[PDB]
Design a protein around this motif. Structure first.
Motif, PDB file in Angstrom:
ATOM      1  N   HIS A  48       0.728  -1.652   0.000  1.00  0.00           N
ATOM      2  CA  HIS A  48      -0.136   0.412   0.134  1.00  0.00           C
ATOM      3  C   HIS A  48       1.187   1.257  -0.022  1.00  0.00           C
ATOM      4  O   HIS A  48       0.604   1.750   1.384  1.00  0.00           O
ATOM      5  CB  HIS A  48      -0.987  -0.122   0.981  1.00  0.00           C
ATOM      6  N   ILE A  49       1.923   1.289  -0.776  1.00  0.00           N
ATOM      7  CA  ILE A  49       2.316   2.344  -1.037  1.00  0.00           C
ATOM      8  C   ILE A  49       2.556   3.216  -2.583  1.00  0.00           C
ATOM      9  O   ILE A  49       2.516   2.430  -3.696  1.00  0.00           O
ATOM     10  CB  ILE A  49       4.663   1.624  -0.821  1.00  0.00           C
ATOM     11  N   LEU A  61      11.036   8.304  -7.623  1.00  0.00           N
ATOM     12  CA  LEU A  61      11.732   7.944  -7.173  1.00  0.00           C
ATOM     13  C   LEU A  61      10.833   5.980  -6.050  1.00  0.00           C
ATOM     14  O   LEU A  61      11.747   5.201  -6.391  1.00  0.00           O
ATOM     15  CB  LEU A  61      12.169   8.531  -6.101  1.00  0.00           C
ATOM     16  N   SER A  62       9.418   5.863  -6.370  1.00  0.00           N
ATOM     17  CA  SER A  62       9.158   5.046  -5.549  1.00  0.00           C
ATOM     18  C   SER A  62       8.099   4.275  -6.192  1.00  0.00           C
ATOM     19  O   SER A  62       8.386   3.018  -6.537  1.00  0.00           O
ATOM     20  CB  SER A  62       8.023   5.303  -4.506  1.00  0.00           C
ATOM     21  N   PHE A  96       2.212  -1.824 -12.021  1.00  0.00           N
ATOM     22  CA  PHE A  96       2.106  -0.251 -12.354  1.00  0.00           C
ATOM     23  C   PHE A  96       2.010  -0.300 -10.797  1.00  0.00           C
ATOM     24  O   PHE A  96       1.736  -0.860  -9.595  1.00  0.00           O
ATOM     25  CB  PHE A  96       0.715  -0.083 -12.831  1.00  0.00           C
ATOM     26  N   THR A  97       2.102   1.635 -10.967  1.00  0.00           N
ATOM     27  CA  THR A  97       1.816   1.937  -9.106  1.00  0.00           C
ATOM     28  C   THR A  97       1.045   3.009  -9.513  1.00  0.00           C
ATOM     29  O   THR A  97       0.132   3.754 -10.680  1.00  0.00           O
ATOM     30  CB  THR A  97       3.392   2.901  -9.043  1.00  0.00           C
ATOM     31  N   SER A  98      -0.307   3.090  -7.847  1.00  0.00           N
ATOM     32  CA  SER A  98      -1.285   4.039  -8.205  1.00  0.00           C
ATOM     33  C   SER A  98      -1.050   4.866  -6.978  1.00  0.00           C
ATOM     34  O   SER A  98      -0.216   4.651  -5.514  1.00  0.00           O
ATOM     35  CB  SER A  98      -2.371   2.517  -8.097  1.00  0.00           C
ATOM     36  N   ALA A 202      12.707   0.037   5.275  1.00  0.00           N
ATOM     37  CA  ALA A 202      11.423  -0.095   6.442  1.00  0.00           C
ATOM     38  C   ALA A 202      10.280   0.151   5.863  1.00  0.00           C
ATOM     39  O   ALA A 202       9.058  -0.748   6.561  1.00  0.00           O
ATOM     40  CB  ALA A 202      11.809   0.878   7.087  1.00  0.00           C
ATOM     41  N   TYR A 203       9.550   0.763   4.769  1.00  0.00           N
ATOM     42  CA  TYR A 203       8.103   0.692   3.783  1.00  0.00           C
ATOM     43  C   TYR A 203       7.956  -0.404   3.252  1.00  0.00           C
ATOM     44  O   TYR A 203       6.755  -0.750   4.176  1.00  0.00           O
ATOM     45  CB  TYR A 203       8.838   1.502   3.353  1.00  0.00           C
ATOM     46  N   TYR A 204       8.815  -1.520   3.005  1.00  0.00           N
ATOM     47  CA  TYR A 204       8.280  -2.400   2.716  1.00  0.00           C
ATOM     48  C   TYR A 204       7.454  -3.786   3.412  1.00  0.00           C
ATOM     49  O   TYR A 204       7.213  -4.468   3.700  1.00  0.00           O
ATOM     50  CB  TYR A 204       8.863  -3.196   1.057  1.00  0.00           C
ATOM     51  N   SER A 205       8.810  -3.875   4.445  1.00  0.00           N
ATOM     52  CA  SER A 205       8.443  -4.582   5.610  1.00  0.00           C
ATOM     53  C   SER A 205       7.503  -4.009   6.414  1.00  0.00           C
ATOM     54  O   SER A 205       7.057  -4.941   7.558  1.00  0.00           O
ATOM     55  CB  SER A 205       9.778  -4.012   6.701  1.00  0.00           C
ATOM     56  N   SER A 206       6.818  -3.061   6.356  1.00  0.00           N
ATOM     57  CA  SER A 206       5.785  -2.477   7.853  1.00  0.00           C
ATOM     58  C   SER A 206       5.094  -2.886   7.245  1.00  0.00           C
ATOM     59  O   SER A 206       4.594  -3.277   5.683  1.00  0.00           O
ATOM     60  CB  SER A 206       5.834  -0.910   7.261  1.00  0.00           C
TER      61      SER A 206
END
Lengths: 935, 932
Positions: A48-49, A61-62, A96-98, A202-206
């Motif tokens: 959910h990023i 970058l994301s 894809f990214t949203s 950190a973000y993926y691990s959350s």
């Protein structure tokens, strides 16, 4: 991280697949779905990023990081066997990214999940982030940006980000670009790879990641494999609050923008922000308000604007951005009169909202929507093995796994205060005006920096918002009445003790012919009935054909408003103009089907025509005939050949000469005359008792005599058109010139005797045999024209082969190329081995033997056989046995004596659009083929 | 008449015999006639019909050969017809001979006077033959009424004497009285035939003098007894029957009202011919005319009134009135209406202009006598020769150059209630008639109308609503012929081509007749679309003809003619006659049809008549039914009488009114110009008709796709087809077998027609003469939808399979006969066929009609016959055998055979192909290509 919450969750009663949803100790949301019956298997992971990110150091970058996870670093591209493994199992994945989340879906043909699971596990467990890898990805990200620049949908979405508060990070550019990706950080001194390291750790691990498996393997097998490779991933316990407050500070409220897109289109958007109200999703009030705005029944908002003509189409729906802030959007179609009256249209929308305030929230309409939602949920349709995974993974983050299936399909609570709150949100104070038109170009001096979209963002001086608030008055609009038909019978009627594999003539009368069938291989209440009405006067004169079309066009247009409720029910009404008869299509649930059918019959029997409606319909018909003058040559050539084949046809130019004297009084007089004598043909289908079905036919005929005074046609008043007889010894050519297309079009056609089971097979096989070589050389290697056609023609109970080619070459030269192809095919069939010929017939046999996939499709095959009058429902089953019997020698003989240049029975005719001086004289000379005897 | 040739030479013998000499070189056949002033009225009172018996006896009188038929066999050698009859006061004989044999025929007739045998064996055969002639007359309904009229006037008067005669009166009563009938014939012949009043007219061509010298010497052989002519001073009625109504039963279903007025012999004076002039007034149909009043009531459809024949001292006047059910109820009122017209005539009085206009029309028309039949011309001349010289009778009878207004007043005065003798003929009088005439068995009764009603007729003498007829144009604008154009085409060409019009023009040159013919065809697609559409079209045509008939009568009086026909393709208009009112008449006809008002009562009666016709076909000859069934298949789409009857009930007056503008909205017109019309003037007439149509109905040209003709079903090769239908009304059974060959072509037409001619002479002798299976025999080719077929139609009470087998046997016999016939005999057969095809029309109308048939067929080769006859001459016996083998042969591969079987009410095939549903068969079979 070993954990598994256990619950038994209800699913659509019809659906059979069994699923168990569990949560791991690490907190990854896990859904296990087992479907052994389906050959394909799948899995999906959603983090959910979004493209928008809390750090604003670089843009995209994301997006680069989600791409960096599918690159496979350097090891996966280095292994061509990894890519080969995906190709072997026919697995295609889209990444894809949203803004809310990044989503990826992949598929495996059968039990190839283990290897795929390990490959996906490696990226999360340890991403290499190699230098050689980064070089390929940065180029790919730049290419992804290129396509987004020309995407008008994305341009509107980025414009919404621009209308976001500039200080707020919502105004960041999600796509990014190559200059931002690498050139901008190196001068800044920021390192892209170091940021990718920190974000992944950190973000993926959350716990923002959800995993779903669609594997056919048992749920216990699914549990062991998924838990072992997702146990290693841990939780950094990083909380993400998204955006706490709406970005807009009211600074950009009450402003009017003019947008010029690359495409020419006209849409109006009014922007109002709205509160989240996520916890009370039971009522779903905002969507319910949108349904009332988008309704097309009595006293509808669109219905008034339709009379003005300012708005052709109105759609209202909820718009969702971040969880914290959501918006409401209304889209109106813009017309030249509408553009002049833009302010009046805005006031009229407020007038409907004023009516909604006066009526208040209504429990009955919400209850009716709940009943419709329950019916739709019980009969789930269009289940997808691929892409279903991505949707559920996104839902899992915001919704409990047990409730994900029924969250959007069921309404459990009423929220009147929420309906009042959304109504309060829709006020001119929160209104923002965005208008899209090509004409606006040159009046806009401000251009968006990201994409080349020009919006003035000018601040309306002398704002008229105050006038709209001051002049608000109760609207003339009235709330829609309860739907007449709601399906209540979900039980399927028991099969009749007598079993018929094909339709049977239970009732035969001079007034009507009745074919009946019961549902087999399908278990749904849904039943479909097609009725044909035939009258001689419709094709008698060119005036008669023109007047009949105008009456039918007016008929459906008048009934369209009355049948909007039927569309919501799912019942399908179709009224279409056919030269021989009028086609009425009724589809949907059997219980409420008769009420709609009878109302259509009464409207058809007695129709009232308005002069204003007649004038607009007449103008539209006249414009269509004018369009054919500038129409493409290949379609024009197809029409010219078709006109010659029928015994008598009306020229398009003649049809638009004789529209000069057409008047409303002649049309009104014609409707009783045509209705007075006609014959009814019936094709009832679905699960119903024969006695009840016979009663339904009886009432329809009884109503037609009661109103239209329809009486049975005399014998010989039902005769099909007869195709002109070919010389059999000559090739005849006439020349006409196109005015708008630089490609010259020539059409060559070969008549082939009369329809017969063996004759149908010979024509179909020859077309199949020549189709692959024609694609190999004429379509591609020669590339004379993009449009090359080598397919069978069936009309007037006759078979033919038609070659429609449009090319920038002399028509005679194109004919010579077709002749060269025919001689090449003669040699090719002889060159082709008998085993290859058997493979050709087998491929055609599989294509012919297609089992019905839908109840409607099964009925359609019977409908085609009866309208042709063959009545041969089982003809395909008899024909396929003959196709195996068919031999190569017979096919060579069929062409050599009939379709060959030197053939004695040579049926060749030529139509040229860039001599047959008179079409009528040539047609009068040719005899007429008899109608095929009915089986 | 300039058109008539010679006939102006006459001589009167000292005996008083009247001789007229005719010498026409153009006439190819000689002729001769005899007459004498003796009659049934002048027969001895006891004997009945002695003169009629004697007229037959004169022919066998010659003693030159002992054969009664020797004169008849002589006439047969010269192929000249000889017929003789006896009138009330005259006995007439006529015969014709070969062109160069006139003298020989006269000599044989002269032998009768020198010796009249009147043999005993001849008398015995004659009495039976005369009785047989009387017996045949009894069945004639008209004859039975005539015999009763003669007897009723007075039993004592000679008027009651029988004219025909019967065997019992002629021989049985005299022979028992001891009188010898043969002696009576000889004495009567000397006393009356030989004595005086003979009138011989001779037609010759070799020379006027050659006949004259022989006739004077030979006709002086009889010695005149100077016997005078019988005359009657007063009418036979003694006024006992006057004012006495009669009711008469007729053998046929005819309803007529007859009133007899005794009048003086105005015709003997011949000064003005007043009675016929008065009759024209009553007969004329115009605003305020007696017929128009009767038609409005509906009591009488039509009436005819001419001066009745009268004796030397008296004449009679009678009216013939058609009777309808309502008219029969109001018969007294109809007689009162006739009296009202007479009173209106009294108020108008005699008018010089009406007589002058009739005289002018007669004088111009007398100059324009188109043709006279040579046979029987002498007989009519012989009758009037006794009372008037030919020059005087022709001029006086035709145009009445002398005018007497007093005579017209006298005849009008003669018609009166006291003068009326009343009689009624109706089929409702059965069982109400007691009195029966002995000679003809006619039943009539005396039912005097109450004296008070007769007084009512006398006291009612008031004119009703009658208007004097308006003067019309009875004179051609130019008697002379318009000069032929400097550029002329022998056959009509397409002088003008238009999207809405087609024009063909020829000016008659050899005929040199002012009269001309114009033909127009209107095309409407909707007429054939539905059984209801075909039915309403007939009703509209019938209503249109009835409405414009009153105006059309004026053209008929001028000799101009119009025709309206409901062809399936569309309305047909033809105008024929003098050009004086021909353009004016054409415009008026267009005005009535394009804009029309429909009378409800007229529509209802017309609808009933059409419905009556549909039910009538159930009772029809079996052979006629077979033709109808074959016609349905040949014309493809067509409608049976049954479905038409249901559709006829469906039609309503408002629907019919709505359809007439739609039918007239778009039309295509093709025209043929013939006769004495200038091409430029004809082009103006063509412009006028289209201009009238566009103003009245806004006519538009049909699109080429819209304009199409019918097609014919195609039978398979080596195929035999049959179907059975039963006729309940007729005991006998009729079979029609149609053998199609090919689309009509010049070679194809000649070959099949040659076969039909080759078998026609054998078919009559082999089948009708020898087999004698049935009275109805036909072996003729049939043309429909541009396809040639041969049809054999036989009606007999014999098994249909047996009759069809006989037809097949006849064809096999004909194939053997073709081989048997010598080449020279075959050439003789083709020569007869060539002469039959190459026949020149003797009338302007016939040639134009031949051109018209080709134009409607869409074939524009007018001179097709000359090319076709040349091909017919080239034909060989082998070629006809090949044509028989390809299609006519029983086992022929390309043969197409269709059989229509009409079964008898109370009543096999080697191959059976029964047709259950005609519609299924029509869908099954292909359609023949339309001819280019």
């Amino acid at each position: 991280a070993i954990k598994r919450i256990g619950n038994h969750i209800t699913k659509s009663p019809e659906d059979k697949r069994e699923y168990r949803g569990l949560e791991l100790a690490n907190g990854i949301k896990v859904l296990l779905i087992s479907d052994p019956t389906t050959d394909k298997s799948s899995a999906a992971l959603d983090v959910h990023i979004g493209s928008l990110s809390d750090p604003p150091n670089i843009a995209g970058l994301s997006h680069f990081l989600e791409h960096m996870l599918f690159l496979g670093t350097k090891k996966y591209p280095k292994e061509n066997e990894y890519s080969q493994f995906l190709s072997e199992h026919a697995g295609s994945s889209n990444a894809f990214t949203s803004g809310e989340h990044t989503n990826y879906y992949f598929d495996v043909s059968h039990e190839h999940l283990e290897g795929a699971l390990d490959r996906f596990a490696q990226f999360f467990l340890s991403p290499l982030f190699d230098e050689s890898a980064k070089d390929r990805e940065v180029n790919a990200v730049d290419s992804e940006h290129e396509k987004n620049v020309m995407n008008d949908a994305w341009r509107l979405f980025q414009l919404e980000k621009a209308t976001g508060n500039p200080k707020h990070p919502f105004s960041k550019f999600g796509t990014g670009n190559k200059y931002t990706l690498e050139t901008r950080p190196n001068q800044e001194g920021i390192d892209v790879r170091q940021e990718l390291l920190k974000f992944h750790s950190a973000y993926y691990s959350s716990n923002l990641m959800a995993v779903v498996v669609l594997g056919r393997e048992s749920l216990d097998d699914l549990t062991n494999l998924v838990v072992k490779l997702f146990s290693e991933v841990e939780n950094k316990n990083v909380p993400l609050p998204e955006f706490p407050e709406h970005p807009f500070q009211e600074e950009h409220l009450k402003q009017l923008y003019k947008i010029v897109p690359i495409k020419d289109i006209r849409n109006l958007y009014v922007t109002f922000p709205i509160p989240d109200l996520q916890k009370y999703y039971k009522s779903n009030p905002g969507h319910y308000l949108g349904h009332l705005i988008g309704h097309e029944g009595p006293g509808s908002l669109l219905s008034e604007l339709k009379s003005k003509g300012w708005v052709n189409t109105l759609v209202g729906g909820q718009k969702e951005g971040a969880r914290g802030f959501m918006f409401f959007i209304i889209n109106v179609d813009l017309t030249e009169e509408g553009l002049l009256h833009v302010e009046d249209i805005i006031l009229h929308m407020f007038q409907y909202i004023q009516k909604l305030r006066a009526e208040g929230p209504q429990e009955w309409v919400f209850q009716e929507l709940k009943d419709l939602n329950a019916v739709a949920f019980r009969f789930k349709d269009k289940e997808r093995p691929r892409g279903y995974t991505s949707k559920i993974a996104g839902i899992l983050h915001y919704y409990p796994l047990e409730e994900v299936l029924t969250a959007e399909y069921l309404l459990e609570e009423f929220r009147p205060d929420l309906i009042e709150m959304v109504l309060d949100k829709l006020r001119p104070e929160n209104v923002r005006v965005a208008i899209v038109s090509k004409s606006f170009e040159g009046k806009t001096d401000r251009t968006e920096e990201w994409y080349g979209t020009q919006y003035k963002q000018e601040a309306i001086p002398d704002e008229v918002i105050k006038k709209w608030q001051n002049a608000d008055l109760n609207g003339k609009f009235k709330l829609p009445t309860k739907n007449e038909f709601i399906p209540t019978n979900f039980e399927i009627l028991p099969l009749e003790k007598e079993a018929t594999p094909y339709p049977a003539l239970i009732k035969d009368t001079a007034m009507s012919k009745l074919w009946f069938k019961q549902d087999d291989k399908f278990f749904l209440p849904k039943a479909n009935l097609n009725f044909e009405f035939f009258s001689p006067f419709a094709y008698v004169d060119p005036l008669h054909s023109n007047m009949a079309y105008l009456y039918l066009e007016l008929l459906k247009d008048s009934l369209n408003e009355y049948a909007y409720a039927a569309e919501l029910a799912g019942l399908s009404y179709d009224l279409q103009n056919t030269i021989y008869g009028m086609y009425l299509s009724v589809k949907g649930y059997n219980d409420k089907q008769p009420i709609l059918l009878k109302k259509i019959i009464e409207k058809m029997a007695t129709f009232e025509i308005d002069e204003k409606r007649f004038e607009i319909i007449k103008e539209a018909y006249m414009r269509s005939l004018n369009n054919f003058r500038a129409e493409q040559p290949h379609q024009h050539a197809m029409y010219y050949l078709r006109l010659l084949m029928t015994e008598v046809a009306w020229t398009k130019d003649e049809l638009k000469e004789a529209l000069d004297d057409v008047t409303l009084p002649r049309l009104k007089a014609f409707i009783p005359q045509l209705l007075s004598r006609l014959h009814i043909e019936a094709l009832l289908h679905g699960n119903i008792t024969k006695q009840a079905a016979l009663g339904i036919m009886q009432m329809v005929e009884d109503t037609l005599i009661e109103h239209a005074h329809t009486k049975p046609l005399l014998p010989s008043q039902l005769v099909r058109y007869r195709e002109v007889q070919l010389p059999d010894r000559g090739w005849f050519v006439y020349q006409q010139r196109n005015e708008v297309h630089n490609n010259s079009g020539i059409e060559i056609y070969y008549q082939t005797d009369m329809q017969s089971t063996s004759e149908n097979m010979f024509l179909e096989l020859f077309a199949q045999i020549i189709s692959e070589p024609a694609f190999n050389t004429l379509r591609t290697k020669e590339q004379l024209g993009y449009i090359v056609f080598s397919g069978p023609r069936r009309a007037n109970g006759i078979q033919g082969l038609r070659f429609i080619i449009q090319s920038e070459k002399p028509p005679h030269y194109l004919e010579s190329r077709v002749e060269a192809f025919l001689i090449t095919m003669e040699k090719s069939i002889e060159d082709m081995t008998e085993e290859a010929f058997q493979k050709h017939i087998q491929a055609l046999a599989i294509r012919r033997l297609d089992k019905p996939k839908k109840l409607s499709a099964e009925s359609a095959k019977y409908w085609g056989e009866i309208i042709s009058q063959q009545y041969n429902f089982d003809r395909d089953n008899t024909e396929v046995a003959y196709l195996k019997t068919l031999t190569k020698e017979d096919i060579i003989k069929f062409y050599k004596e009939m379709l060959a240049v030197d053939a004695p029975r040579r049926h060749k005719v030529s139509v040229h659009v860039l001599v047959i001086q008179n079409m009528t004289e040539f047609k009068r000379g040719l005899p007429l083929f008899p109608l095929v005897k009915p089986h």
